Amino acid sequence: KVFGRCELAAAMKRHGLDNYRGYSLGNWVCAAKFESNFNTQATNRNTDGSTDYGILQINSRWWCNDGRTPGSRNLCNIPCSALLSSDITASVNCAKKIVSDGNGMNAWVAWRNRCKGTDVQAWIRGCRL
Ligand code: NA
Ligand SMILES: [Rh+]
Ligand SMILES: [Rh+]
Ligand SMILES: [Rh+]
């Protein structure tokens, strides 16, 4: 599923991301835009052999089992394929563990480089929430 901006914002708010660990909804929407272009099916291979999965490009190195990432952890206790569903519940629940883990949203390279210290409120302007 390729989400609309306001469609995703509404889904993220419902799934408990608005101000999660102090990160406004616009932060999560901006991260999703630059990570996946709002596409639940997005996959990208990392140079280390790990793969990033879904709307927030969660990494098989630490967070999910994809059957092909040797000596990696599965800290969200899920198959990485669960992160590609048109239902974002598994991505949201895993993102909550990631962002709680001490580095906050700096875990997302696209967030640090493209969203951090920007006017992220612009990502939710116009949306019915
Ligand atoms: Na893994
Ligand atoms: Rh939902
Ligand atoms: Rh600003
Ligand atoms: Rh509302």
Short mmCIF file of N, CA and C and ligand atoms in Angstrom, two decimals:
data_model
loop_
_atom_site.label_atom_id
_atom_site.label_comp_id
_atom_site.label_asym_id
_atom_site.label_seq_id
_atom_site.Cartn_x
_atom_site.Cartn_y
_atom_site.Cartn_z
N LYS A 1 0.89 -1.23 0.00
CA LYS A 1 0.00 0.00 0.00
C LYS A 1 0.90 1.24 0.00
N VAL A 2 0.66 2.17 -0.93
CA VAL A 2 1.28 3.52 -0.92
C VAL A 2 0.31 4.48 -0.24
N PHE A 3 0.66 4.93 0.97
CA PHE A 3 -0.20 5.80 1.82
C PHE A 3 -0.20 7.21 1.25
N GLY A 4 -1.32 7.93 1.40
CA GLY A 4 -1.31 9.40 1.32
C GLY A 4 -0.72 9.96 2.60
N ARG A 5 -0.23 11.18 2.55
CA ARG A 5 0.39 11.88 3.71
C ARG A 5 -0.57 11.89 4.91
N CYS A 6 -1.79 12.44 4.74
CA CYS A 6 -2.78 12.59 5.84
C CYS A 6 -3.31 11.21 6.25
N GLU A 7 -3.46 10.30 5.29
CA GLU A 7 -3.88 8.89 5.52
C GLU A 7 -2.88 8.25 6.50
N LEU A 8 -1.58 8.42 6.24
CA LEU A 8 -0.54 7.81 7.12
C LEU A 8 -0.53 8.48 8.51
N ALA A 9 -0.51 9.82 8.55
CA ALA A 9 -0.58 10.60 9.80
C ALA A 9 -1.71 10.05 10.69
N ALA A 10 -2.92 9.90 10.14
CA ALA A 10 -4.11 9.40 10.88
C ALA A 10 -3.84 7.99 11.42
N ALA A 11 -3.31 7.09 10.58
CA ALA A 11 -2.93 5.71 10.97
C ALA A 11 -1.87 5.73 12.08
N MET A 12 -0.85 6.59 11.96
CA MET A 12 0.23 6.66 12.98
C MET A 12 -0.34 7.15 14.32
N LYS A 13 -1.19 8.18 14.28
CA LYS A 13 -1.80 8.77 15.52
C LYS A 13 -2.61 7.68 16.23
N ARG A 14 -3.48 6.98 15.49
CA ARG A 14 -4.31 5.86 16.01
C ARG A 14 -3.41 4.80 16.65
N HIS A 15 -2.24 4.52 16.07
CA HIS A 15 -1.34 3.43 16.54
C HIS A 15 -0.38 3.93 17.63
N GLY A 16 -0.53 5.18 18.08
CA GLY A 16 0.08 5.72 19.31
C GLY A 16 1.41 6.44 19.10
N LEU A 17 1.70 6.95 17.90
CA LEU A 17 3.01 7.58 17.57
C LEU A 17 3.02 9.08 17.87
N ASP A 18 1.88 9.78 17.81
CA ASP A 18 1.80 11.24 18.10
C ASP A 18 2.41 11.52 19.47
N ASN A 19 3.51 12.27 19.50
CA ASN A 19 4.30 12.63 20.71
C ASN A 19 4.88 11.39 21.40
N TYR A 20 5.01 10.23 20.74
CA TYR A 20 5.69 9.05 21.35
C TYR A 20 7.16 9.41 21.62
N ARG A 21 7.58 9.36 22.89
CA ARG A 21 8.96 9.70 23.35
C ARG A 21 9.30 11.13 22.95
N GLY A 22 8.27 11.96 22.80
CA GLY A 22 8.35 13.41 22.57
C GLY A 22 8.45 13.77 21.11
N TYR A 23 8.29 12.80 20.20
CA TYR A 23 8.39 13.04 18.74
C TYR A 23 7.00 13.27 18.18
N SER A 24 6.75 14.52 17.81
CA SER A 24 5.49 14.96 17.16
C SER A 24 5.21 14.08 15.94
N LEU A 25 3.94 13.96 15.60
CA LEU A 25 3.46 13.20 14.43
C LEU A 25 4.17 13.62 13.15
N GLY A 26 4.45 14.91 12.96
CA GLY A 26 5.12 15.39 11.74
C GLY A 26 6.49 14.74 11.56
N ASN A 27 7.19 14.44 12.65
CA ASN A 27 8.51 13.75 12.62
C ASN A 27 8.37 12.37 12.00
N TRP A 28 7.36 11.61 12.43
CA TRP A 28 7.16 10.21 12.00
C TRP A 28 6.73 10.20 10.53
N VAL A 29 5.91 11.16 10.13
CA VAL A 29 5.43 11.26 8.73
C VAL A 29 6.60 11.63 7.81
N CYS A 30 7.45 12.57 8.22
CA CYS A 30 8.63 13.03 7.47
C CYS A 30 9.59 11.84 7.30
N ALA A 31 9.79 11.08 8.37
CA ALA A 31 10.70 9.90 8.37
C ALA A 31 10.20 8.88 7.33
N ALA A 32 8.91 8.57 7.38
CA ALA A 32 8.26 7.60 6.48
C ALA A 32 8.41 8.08 5.04
N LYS A 33 8.21 9.38 4.78
CA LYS A 33 8.32 9.93 3.40
C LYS A 33 9.73 9.66 2.85
N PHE A 34 10.79 10.01 3.58
CA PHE A 34 12.16 9.92 3.04
C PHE A 34 12.68 8.49 3.17
N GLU A 35 12.09 7.66 4.02
CA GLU A 35 12.56 6.25 4.15
C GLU A 35 11.97 5.37 3.04
N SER A 36 10.69 5.52 2.72
CA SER A 36 9.90 4.52 1.97
C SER A 36 9.02 5.16 0.90
N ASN A 37 8.99 6.50 0.83
CA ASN A 37 8.01 7.24 -0.01
C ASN A 37 6.58 6.78 0.31
N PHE A 38 6.32 6.46 1.58
CA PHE A 38 5.00 6.05 2.14
C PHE A 38 4.53 4.68 1.61
N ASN A 39 5.44 3.85 1.11
CA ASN A 39 5.15 2.52 0.52
C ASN A 39 5.45 1.45 1.55
N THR A 40 4.43 0.71 1.97
CA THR A 40 4.57 -0.38 2.97
C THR A 40 5.49 -1.49 2.42
N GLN A 41 5.65 -1.61 1.10
CA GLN A 41 6.37 -2.75 0.45
C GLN A 41 7.84 -2.44 0.23
N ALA A 42 8.30 -1.24 0.58
CA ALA A 42 9.67 -0.80 0.26
C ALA A 42 10.69 -1.72 0.96
N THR A 43 11.66 -2.21 0.21
CA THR A 43 12.84 -2.96 0.74
C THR A 43 14.10 -2.34 0.17
N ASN A 44 15.17 -2.27 0.97
CA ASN A 44 16.48 -1.80 0.47
C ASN A 44 17.58 -2.61 1.17
N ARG A 45 18.52 -3.14 0.39
CA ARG A 45 19.69 -3.92 0.87
C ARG A 45 20.76 -2.95 1.38
N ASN A 46 21.33 -3.21 2.56
CA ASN A 46 22.45 -2.43 3.15
C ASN A 46 23.76 -3.09 2.71
N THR A 47 24.86 -2.34 2.72
CA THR A 47 26.21 -2.81 2.26
C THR A 47 26.65 -4.00 3.12
N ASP A 48 26.17 -4.11 4.36
CA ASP A 48 26.59 -5.17 5.32
C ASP A 48 25.82 -6.48 5.09
N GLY A 49 24.86 -6.54 4.15
CA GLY A 49 24.07 -7.75 3.88
C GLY A 49 22.71 -7.75 4.57
N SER A 50 22.46 -6.78 5.46
CA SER A 50 21.18 -6.63 6.16
C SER A 50 20.21 -5.97 5.15
N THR A 51 18.92 -5.95 5.46
CA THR A 51 17.90 -5.33 4.58
C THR A 51 17.01 -4.47 5.47
N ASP A 52 16.54 -3.34 4.93
CA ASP A 52 15.55 -2.44 5.57
C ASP A 52 14.16 -2.72 4.98
N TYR A 53 13.14 -2.78 5.83
CA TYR A 53 11.79 -3.26 5.48
C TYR A 53 10.71 -2.24 5.85
N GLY A 54 9.89 -1.91 4.86
CA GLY A 54 8.58 -1.30 5.11
C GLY A 54 8.64 0.21 5.22
N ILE A 55 7.56 0.76 5.75
CA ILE A 55 7.23 2.21 5.76
C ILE A 55 8.34 2.97 6.51
N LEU A 56 8.91 2.38 7.56
CA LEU A 56 10.02 3.02 8.32
C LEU A 56 11.35 2.26 8.15
N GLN A 57 11.49 1.40 7.14
CA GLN A 57 12.80 0.85 6.74
C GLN A 57 13.53 0.33 7.99
N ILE A 58 12.86 -0.53 8.73
CA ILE A 58 13.41 -1.25 9.91
C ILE A 58 14.42 -2.32 9.44
N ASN A 59 15.58 -2.36 10.11
CA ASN A 59 16.81 -3.05 9.65
C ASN A 59 16.80 -4.48 10.22
N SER A 60 17.07 -5.48 9.38
CA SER A 60 17.18 -6.92 9.79
C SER A 60 18.42 -7.13 10.69
N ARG A 61 19.35 -6.18 10.74
CA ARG A 61 20.62 -6.29 11.52
C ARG A 61 20.26 -6.45 13.00
N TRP A 62 19.22 -5.74 13.46
CA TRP A 62 18.86 -5.66 14.90
C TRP A 62 17.43 -6.09 15.19
N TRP A 63 16.46 -5.84 14.29
CA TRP A 63 15.04 -5.66 14.71
C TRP A 63 14.12 -6.78 14.23
N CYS A 64 14.47 -7.50 13.16
CA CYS A 64 13.59 -8.53 12.55
C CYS A 64 14.43 -9.64 11.90
N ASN A 65 13.81 -10.82 11.76
CA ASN A 65 14.41 -12.02 11.14
C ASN A 65 13.93 -12.12 9.69
N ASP A 66 14.86 -12.07 8.73
CA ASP A 66 14.54 -12.25 7.29
C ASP A 66 15.15 -13.55 6.75
N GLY A 67 15.74 -14.38 7.60
CA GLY A 67 16.33 -15.66 7.18
C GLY A 67 17.65 -15.53 6.45
N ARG A 68 18.17 -14.32 6.19
CA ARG A 68 19.42 -14.17 5.42
C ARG A 68 20.36 -13.11 6.02
N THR A 69 20.23 -12.77 7.30
CA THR A 69 21.12 -11.76 7.94
C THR A 69 21.91 -12.47 9.04
N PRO A 70 23.06 -13.08 8.68
CA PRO A 70 23.85 -13.87 9.62
C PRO A 70 24.35 -13.06 10.83
N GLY A 71 24.22 -13.63 12.03
CA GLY A 71 24.72 -13.06 13.30
C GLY A 71 24.01 -11.76 13.65
N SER A 72 22.72 -11.66 13.30
CA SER A 72 21.87 -10.48 13.58
C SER A 72 20.91 -10.81 14.73
N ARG A 73 20.36 -9.78 15.37
CA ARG A 73 19.37 -9.96 16.46
C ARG A 73 17.99 -9.76 15.85
N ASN A 74 16.97 -10.23 16.55
CA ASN A 74 15.54 -10.05 16.20
C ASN A 74 14.85 -9.42 17.41
N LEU A 75 15.15 -8.15 17.71
CA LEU A 75 14.70 -7.48 18.96
C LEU A 75 13.19 -7.20 18.93
N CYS A 76 12.54 -7.10 17.77
CA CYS A 76 11.06 -6.91 17.73
C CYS A 76 10.36 -8.27 17.65
N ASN A 77 11.11 -9.37 17.57
CA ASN A 77 10.59 -10.76 17.60
C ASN A 77 9.51 -10.94 16.51
N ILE A 78 9.87 -10.66 15.25
CA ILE A 78 8.94 -10.75 14.09
C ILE A 78 9.74 -11.18 12.87
N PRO A 79 9.08 -11.83 11.90
CA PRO A 79 9.64 -11.95 10.56
C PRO A 79 9.61 -10.56 9.90
N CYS A 80 10.68 -10.19 9.20
CA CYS A 80 10.82 -8.86 8.53
C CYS A 80 9.67 -8.67 7.54
N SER A 81 9.16 -9.76 6.96
CA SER A 81 8.02 -9.76 6.02
C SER A 81 6.76 -9.17 6.66
N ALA A 82 6.54 -9.36 7.97
CA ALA A 82 5.48 -8.70 8.78
C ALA A 82 5.51 -7.17 8.64
N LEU A 83 6.68 -6.59 8.39
CA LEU A 83 6.86 -5.11 8.27
C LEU A 83 6.41 -4.60 6.89
N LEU A 84 5.89 -5.45 6.00
CA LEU A 84 5.56 -5.04 4.61
C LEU A 84 4.04 -5.04 4.38
N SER A 85 3.28 -5.27 5.43
CA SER A 85 1.81 -5.38 5.39
C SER A 85 1.20 -3.99 5.15
N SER A 86 0.03 -3.91 4.52
CA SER A 86 -0.71 -2.63 4.35
C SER A 86 -1.27 -2.17 5.70
N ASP A 87 -1.27 -3.05 6.71
CA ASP A 87 -1.53 -2.72 8.14
C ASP A 87 -0.17 -2.42 8.81
N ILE A 88 0.01 -1.20 9.33
CA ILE A 88 1.33 -0.68 9.83
C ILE A 88 1.55 -1.05 11.31
N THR A 89 0.64 -1.80 11.94
CA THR A 89 0.75 -2.16 13.38
C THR A 89 2.14 -2.70 13.74
N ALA A 90 2.68 -3.67 13.00
CA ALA A 90 3.98 -4.31 13.33
C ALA A 90 5.12 -3.30 13.17
N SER A 91 5.08 -2.47 12.12
CA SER A 91 6.09 -1.40 11.91
C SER A 91 6.03 -0.41 13.08
N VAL A 92 4.83 0.00 13.49
CA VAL A 92 4.65 1.00 14.58
C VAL A 92 5.16 0.40 15.89
N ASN A 93 4.74 -0.81 16.23
CA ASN A 93 5.13 -1.43 17.52
C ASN A 93 6.64 -1.61 17.58
N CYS A 94 7.29 -1.93 16.45
CA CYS A 94 8.76 -2.13 16.40
C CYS A 94 9.46 -0.76 16.46
N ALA A 95 8.97 0.25 15.74
CA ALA A 95 9.47 1.65 15.79
C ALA A 95 9.45 2.15 17.25
N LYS A 96 8.40 1.83 18.00
CA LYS A 96 8.32 2.25 19.43
C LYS A 96 9.50 1.68 20.24
N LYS A 97 9.88 0.42 20.02
CA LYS A 97 11.04 -0.22 20.71
C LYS A 97 12.35 0.43 20.23
N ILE A 98 12.46 0.68 18.93
CA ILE A 98 13.68 1.30 18.35
C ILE A 98 13.89 2.67 19.01
N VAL A 99 12.87 3.52 18.98
CA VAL A 99 13.01 4.96 19.34
C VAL A 99 13.20 5.08 20.86
N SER A 100 12.75 4.08 21.62
CA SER A 100 12.88 3.99 23.11
C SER A 100 14.28 3.55 23.52
N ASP A 101 15.13 3.18 22.57
CA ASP A 101 16.32 2.33 22.86
C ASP A 101 17.53 3.23 23.16
N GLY A 102 17.36 4.56 23.20
CA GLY A 102 18.39 5.50 23.69
C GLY A 102 18.85 6.49 22.63
N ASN A 103 18.76 6.17 21.33
CA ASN A 103 19.24 7.09 20.25
C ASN A 103 18.07 7.87 19.64
N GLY A 104 16.86 7.62 20.13
CA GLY A 104 15.65 8.29 19.64
C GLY A 104 15.53 8.08 18.15
N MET A 105 15.10 9.10 17.43
CA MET A 105 14.80 8.97 15.98
C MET A 105 16.10 9.08 15.16
N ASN A 106 17.24 9.36 15.80
CA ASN A 106 18.58 9.35 15.13
C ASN A 106 18.86 7.95 14.57
N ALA A 107 18.18 6.90 15.05
CA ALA A 107 18.20 5.54 14.45
C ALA A 107 17.85 5.58 12.95
N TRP A 108 17.01 6.52 12.52
CA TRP A 108 16.61 6.65 11.09
C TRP A 108 17.52 7.68 10.44
N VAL A 109 18.43 7.22 9.57
CA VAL A 109 19.39 8.10 8.85
C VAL A 109 18.60 9.19 8.10
N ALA A 110 17.50 8.86 7.41
CA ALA A 110 16.71 9.85 6.63
C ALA A 110 16.08 10.89 7.57
N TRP A 111 15.69 10.49 8.78
CA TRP A 111 15.17 11.46 9.78
C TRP A 111 16.28 12.43 10.19
N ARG A 112 17.43 11.93 10.63
CA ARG A 112 18.56 12.81 11.04
C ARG A 112 18.92 13.77 9.90
N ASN A 113 18.93 13.32 8.65
CA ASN A 113 19.52 14.10 7.51
C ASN A 113 18.47 14.99 6.84
N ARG A 114 17.18 14.65 6.92
CA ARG A 114 16.14 15.31 6.09
C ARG A 114 14.99 15.89 6.93
N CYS A 115 14.85 15.54 8.21
CA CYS A 115 13.67 15.94 9.02
C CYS A 115 14.10 16.70 10.26
N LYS A 116 15.13 16.20 10.94
CA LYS A 116 15.63 16.79 12.20
C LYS A 116 15.93 18.29 11.97
N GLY A 117 15.38 19.14 12.85
CA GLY A 117 15.58 20.60 12.87
C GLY A 117 14.92 21.29 11.68
N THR A 118 13.92 20.66 11.06
CA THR A 118 13.09 21.24 9.97
C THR A 118 11.71 21.57 10.53
N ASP A 119 10.87 22.25 9.74
CA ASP A 119 9.47 22.52 10.17
C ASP A 119 8.63 21.27 9.86
N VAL A 120 8.69 20.26 10.73
CA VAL A 120 8.02 18.95 10.46
C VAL A 120 6.50 19.09 10.60
N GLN A 121 5.97 20.13 11.26
CA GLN A 121 4.50 20.38 11.34
C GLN A 121 3.92 20.44 9.93
N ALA A 122 4.70 20.91 8.95
CA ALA A 122 4.27 21.02 7.54
C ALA A 122 3.82 19.64 7.03
N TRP A 123 4.32 18.53 7.59
CA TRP A 123 3.96 17.18 7.10
C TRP A 123 2.51 16.82 7.45
N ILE A 124 1.93 17.42 8.49
CA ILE A 124 0.53 17.10 8.90
C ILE A 124 -0.42 18.29 8.61
N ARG A 125 0.03 19.37 7.97
CA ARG A 125 -0.88 20.54 7.70
C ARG A 125 -1.96 20.10 6.71
N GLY A 126 -3.22 20.46 6.96
CA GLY A 126 -4.36 20.11 6.09
C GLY A 126 -5.07 18.84 6.53
N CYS A 127 -4.44 17.99 7.35
CA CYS A 127 -4.98 16.64 7.69
C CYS A 127 -6.07 16.71 8.78
N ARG A 128 -7.14 15.93 8.61
CA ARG A 128 -8.20 15.71 9.63
C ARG A 128 -7.73 14.63 10.62
N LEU A 129 -7.45 15.01 11.88
CA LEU A 129 -6.84 14.16 12.95
C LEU A 129 -7.68 14.23 14.24
NA NA B 1 17.81 -10.11 12.30
RH RH B 2 -4.95 0.47 12.03
RH RH B 3 11.45 26.62 11.36
RH RH B 4 -8.72 15.23 16.60
#
